[PDB]
Amino acid sequence: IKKISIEGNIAAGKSTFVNILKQLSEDWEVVPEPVARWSNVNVLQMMYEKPERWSFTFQTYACLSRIRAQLASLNGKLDAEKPVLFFERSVYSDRYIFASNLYESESMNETEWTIYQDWHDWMNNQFGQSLELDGIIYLQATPETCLHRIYLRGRNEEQGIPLEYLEKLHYKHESWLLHRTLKTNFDYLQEVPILTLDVNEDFKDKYASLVEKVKEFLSTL
Amino acid sequence: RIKKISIEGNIAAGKSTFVNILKQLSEDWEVVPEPVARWSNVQSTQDEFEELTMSQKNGGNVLQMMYEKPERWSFTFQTYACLSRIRAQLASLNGKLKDAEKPVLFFERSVYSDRYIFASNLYESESMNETEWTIYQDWHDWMNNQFGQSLELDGIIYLQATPETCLHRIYLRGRNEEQGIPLEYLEKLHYKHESWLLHRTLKTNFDYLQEVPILTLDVNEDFKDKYASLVEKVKEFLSTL
Numbered sequence A: 001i002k003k004i005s006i007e008g009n010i011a012a013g014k015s016t017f018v019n020i021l022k023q024l025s026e027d028w029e030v031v032p033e034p035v036a037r038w039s040n041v042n043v044l045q046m047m048y049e050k051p052e053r054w055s056f057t058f059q060t061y062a063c064l065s066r067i068r069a070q071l072a073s074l075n076g077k078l079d080a081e082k083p084v085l086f087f088e089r090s091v092y093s094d095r096y097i098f099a100s101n102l103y104e105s106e107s108m109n110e111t112e113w114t115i116y117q118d119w120h121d122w123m124n125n126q127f128g129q130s131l132e133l134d135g136i137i138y139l140q141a142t143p144e145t146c147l148h149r150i151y152l153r154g155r156n157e158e159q160g161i162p163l164e165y166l167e168k169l170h171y172k173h174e175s176w177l178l179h180r181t182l183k184t185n186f187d188y189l190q191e192v193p194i195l196t197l198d199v200n201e202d203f204k205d206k207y208a209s210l211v212e213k214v215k216e217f218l219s220t221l
Numbered sequence B: 001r002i003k004k005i006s007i008e009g010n011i012a013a014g015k016s017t018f019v020n021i022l023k024q025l026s027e028d029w030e031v032v033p034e035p036v037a038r039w040s041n042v043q044s045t046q047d048e049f050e051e052l053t054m055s056q057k058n059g060g061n062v063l064q065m066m067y068e069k070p071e072r073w074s075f076t077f078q079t080y081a082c083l084s085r086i087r088a089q090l091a092s093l094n095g096k097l098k099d100a101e102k103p104v105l106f107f108e109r110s111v112y113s114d115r116y117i118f119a120s121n122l123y124e125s126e127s128m129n130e131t132e133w134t135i136y137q138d139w140h141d142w143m144n145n146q147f148g149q150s151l152e153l154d155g156i157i158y159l160q161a162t163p164e165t166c167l168h169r170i171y172l173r174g175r176n177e178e179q180g181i182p183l184e185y186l187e188k189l190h191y192k193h194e195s196w197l198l199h200r201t202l203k204t205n206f207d208y209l210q211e212v213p214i215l216t217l218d219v220n221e222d223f224k225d226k227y228a229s230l231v232e233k234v235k236e237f238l239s240t241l
Ligand SMILES: Nc1ncnc2c1ncn2[C@@H]1O[C@H](COP(=O)(O)OP(=O)(O)O)[C@@H](O)[C@H]1O
Pocket: A008, A009, A010, A011, A012, A013, A014, A015, A016, A017, A149, A150, A152, A153, A199, A200, A201, A202, A203, A204, A207
């Protein structure tokens, strides 16, 4: 099973795009972010209201529900010829973008962070080899595109998110995936291929061509 | 084929003492310490390069933090306490007792203590809200459907001391973080272990526990008074298995 992680900032349109991709082939399946599991255990609203209190509790639940659902979809599903499983984001995104960001903003203290890294390290050392990515698709949209789209989706918990939060997360994604300067202690990720895609335009325009590029990206793998 | 024996009892019941002495009777016996030292000095792993120039910094005390503000730090504590426990138990399960004839691996507390005794109590005491309590049980259960089976106990030895003995032995031990624990906290935990291990009425999400053999030992006495009898009882206990 070839595993692809779909990465991008909030409301760039990763659920939109991946849902579109699933249909191209029967050999293609998707692992969504468990946002409904998060809305009703509402830990998402809690952390966004009180980031200094609920940040670590969120990252734990977040990453845990992601590991669970990524593993459930390999342990079952697909006799498929050349199967691909696309992940809405990854364990690497949780830790080196969001959790790292919250730390950098002081919504996690040194203790919380250290515990979070030690849990991430262990949690991932049990599997890791099992959920290792073969490729990344970085959906690239500006902070402002992403602020507009948050308003379009209309989710109640995210309406307060300031642009400056999004710029931050945007800088982390560019550093990790475009400049490739961010260091994870998973050194295979340095030899993982990355398809960057501009998705700033309205999907009425340019969009469908992107999907043709993806069929391509997954020929070389 | 390693028999796993969990060693349970309240705080300062004397579990560390009894089982680290008890293990000298056999080379086929080894003990997995409760990783308390990791909880009072929290550290994550260092980069392969960073560690040649950087010291492993002394972390925070998430054990003190939890005592000082349980409604803030109970969830974070339970989560790490359980992770570190599992990690050590599994590591010694894969690690020790190669050339061993009748191996017994004695655990200091279990993953079930942390959930059904300690966390259960912080919930009940309102130190963890429903979300925290629900997130935690969801993690615990998952963790148990993986590495469990590999962790199943063959027995439990319950070292029974009065809340008052525990409190005394807390002062004796002199552990800084625990010095302001009131008798009432120890009372509640005593009660939880009674229901689990003596009366066996406490309702669990793991059925085999209802069947697991339990040896109850009274360790209120000065160590040397009952030592002879306790070792007798224990050995007559491992043979039933
Ligand atoms: N290219 C696009 N053009 C116009 N709207 C888009 C585009 N991509 C996504 N959207 C819309 O913006 C919102 C956020 O997209 P979504 O796929 O939910 O993002 P994510 O899952 O990455 O948070 C949704 O309303 C979606 O319909």
